[PDB]
Structures are given as C-alpha cells and as structure tokens.
Amino acid sequence: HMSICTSEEWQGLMQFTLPVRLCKEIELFHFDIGPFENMWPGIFVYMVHRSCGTSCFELEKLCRFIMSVKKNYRRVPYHNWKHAVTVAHCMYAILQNNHTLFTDLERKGLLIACLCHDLDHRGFSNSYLQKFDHPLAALYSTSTMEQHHFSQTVSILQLEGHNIFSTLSSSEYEQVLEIIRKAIIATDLALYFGNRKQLEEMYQTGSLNLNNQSHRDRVIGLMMTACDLCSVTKLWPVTKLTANDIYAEFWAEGDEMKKLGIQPIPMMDRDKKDEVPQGQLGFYNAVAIPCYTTLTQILPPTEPLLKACRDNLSQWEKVIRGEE
Numbered sequence: 001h002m003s004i005c006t007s008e009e010w011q012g013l014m015q016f017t018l019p020v021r022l023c024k025e026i027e028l029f030h031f032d033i034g035p036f037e038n039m040w041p042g043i044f045v046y047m048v049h050r051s052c053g054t055s056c057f058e059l060e061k062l063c064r065f066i067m068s069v070k071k072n073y074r075r076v077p078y079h080n081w082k083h084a085v086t087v088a089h090c091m092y093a094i095l096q097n098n099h100t101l102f103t104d105l106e107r108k109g110l111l112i113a114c115l116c117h118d119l120d121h122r123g124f125s126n127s128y129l130q131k132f133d134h135p136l137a138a139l140y141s142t143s144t145m146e147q148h149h150f151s152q153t154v155s156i157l158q159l160e161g162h163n164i165f166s167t168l169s170s171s172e173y174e175q176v177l178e179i180i181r182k183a184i185i186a187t188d189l190a191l192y193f194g195n196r197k198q199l200e201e202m203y204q205t206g207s208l209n210l211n212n213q214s215h216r217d218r219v220i221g222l223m224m225t226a227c228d229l230c231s232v233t234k235l236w237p238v239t240k241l242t243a244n245d246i247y248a249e250f251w252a253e254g255d256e257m258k259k260l261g262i263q264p265i266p267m268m269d270r271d272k273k274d275e276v277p278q279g280q281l282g283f284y285n286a287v288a289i290p291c292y293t294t295l296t297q298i299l300p301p302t303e304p305l306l307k308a309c310r311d312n313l314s315q316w317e318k319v320i321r322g323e324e
C-alpha cells in the first residue's frame, strides 16, 4: 500500500550537486527552502552528508528512500513535501550548532524522523478524525495521525532496497527506530504543553540531565516541536505566506464540518478571516514563544530561532494595530 519512486527519479538525485552560492546560506536558521523546489531532495542529501559524513548511508539506498518519502506526501496546502523538508532543515541547523551533544545514531534518526514526520497527512486534524469517526481513529486513538506517520516510515523503510538502516547491528537498528518513533509522536501538539512544563521545571531546579535517557527524549521532543513550527522563524514575508497555507487547510476542514451542519471552531472558519492576525498573536504567545524560549535555555546555540520568532510576533502586533 506504499508508493515507490521510479529509477528516473532516484538516479537523477544521485547526480545532483548543490550550487556553491547555496552552501553558505543552508547553514542559517532563517534560511528559506521555498525558491528551490527542484533541489529539495538534493538539499536533504547534502544535509545528511554534511551532518553524517558522505558514507553514512549507501548513496544508492538513501536516494531511493528520500524520493519515495516524497511520493507519499499528499498535495495538501501545508502538511506537504515542503513542510517536511523545512522541518528537516531546521533540525539540521539545530544539530550542526550543537554537534557533540548528540550521538551519530541520534542525528541520522532525527533527520530521517523530521523528513518522515507527517507522511500521508490528509489535511484533517486529529480532533476531526476522532470527533467523527475516520477509520484511522478506529486504529489508534491518542495522537492518531502521528502513529500513522510512524507506521508509514516503517512501511517505507521495510521496502525492497529501501532500508538505509540495514548496515547497523539489529541493536542499533532497533534503537534508531525508537528514536524515530518517539520524535514523531512528540510532534503531536497536544503533548507539547506537558513536555515544556516538565522541561521548564527540570532546567529551573538544575536537575535536567542529558545523561538521563528520559531527559534526553524530552529535549529531542522539544527540538521536534521547535522544528515543527519553524515557519514562524523565517523572515516576515516568508512567514506571512506560510500562514496562508496553514489557514487554507484549516478552512477546508471547517467547510467539511459546515457541509454536515456542524459549526467549526473559529480557527477553521473562512468566514472569520479578520480574526486571523489575532489568532497568530495568541499562538505565538501561548505556544511559539514558550517553545523557543525553553529550547534556547536548554540549547543556547538555538537562540536565533527565538530572535526570529520575536521579530515575527511584533509584525503580527503591528498588523493588529493597523500598520501593515
């Protein structure tokens, strides 16, 4: 039930090389992949290589994986291929700026995790799918979509010639899959609020321990969340744009509720469009800022992410105040 790439597709990727003028900028947290669609798969390979060295995966195998992952992203407005690469890039930039805090295994796991994190997203919320009553809510019922995403990845990994993790020992294979699973579940925004509070706590008492596996899992989780939302960390015109994409999805969901005579909450209501900039401010304040704030505390190199968020926040304020 999975989808495979064609030989055409994967072999062209083997051949790709990144333009030198992009090399500098790929390393910046605010870097925007948006102009270079074309090169997106290429960019991930680069990033894998620059992160994990040029023979961490058998090149032929890596390309097959990436290009198939691409195939199993739907053509929805926001949770699409582009989202996946954007999130993967942000993790790349976190990983590079904290290089020795994380194991080889972790960096492979996470870059792959981010690339895979919203596989086969239909554009409908976890709420919806349960709240009236999709066959996927019938299979898992806490963090529905995520357990699906993780499943998808695994299905993709277990494809013929697709297993990039093969030449690890079955210990290390069975370990990265754990890293990938927890990191993908982490992306369920529901879970984030708990995780942040604990991490808030632990840092503040001075009991957070990177040698403790469970603390480790949590920081990673926060990292995942920080990457998931990073559109809120790009320069203003980029971010403005992305917002349109996230709303396009929500509103389409709201239409499907309206079609069954059910009032959607205001967020997925295209008839409540002016309330949007006020929607954002709220989101930055309750979710975004807190997210990045705690990640900069734990991981001080991740500070620019926080800085960019603040700058976007004030743009939104100015919109609400009528100055845009």
Ligand SMILES: Cc1cc(C)n2nc(CCc3cc(O)n4nc5ncccc5c4n3)nc2n1
Residues within 6 Å of the ligand: 189, 229, 231, 232, 246, 266, 267, 272, 273, 274, 275, 276, 277, 278, 279, 280, 282, 283
């Ligand atoms: C990149 C990104 C990622 C995620 C998960 N989100 N989630 C949001 C929703 C923000 C929000 C919350 C809310 O309660 N309302 N109410 C509203 N009424 C009207 C208009 C917008 C509203 C709104 N908007 N924006 C995101 N951007």
Ligand SMILES: [Mg+2]
Residues within 6 Å of the ligand: 117, 118, 187, 188
């Ligand atoms: Mg998700």
Ligand SMILES: [Zn+2]
Residues within 6 Å of the ligand: 083, 117, 118, 187, 228
């Ligand atoms: Zn996501």
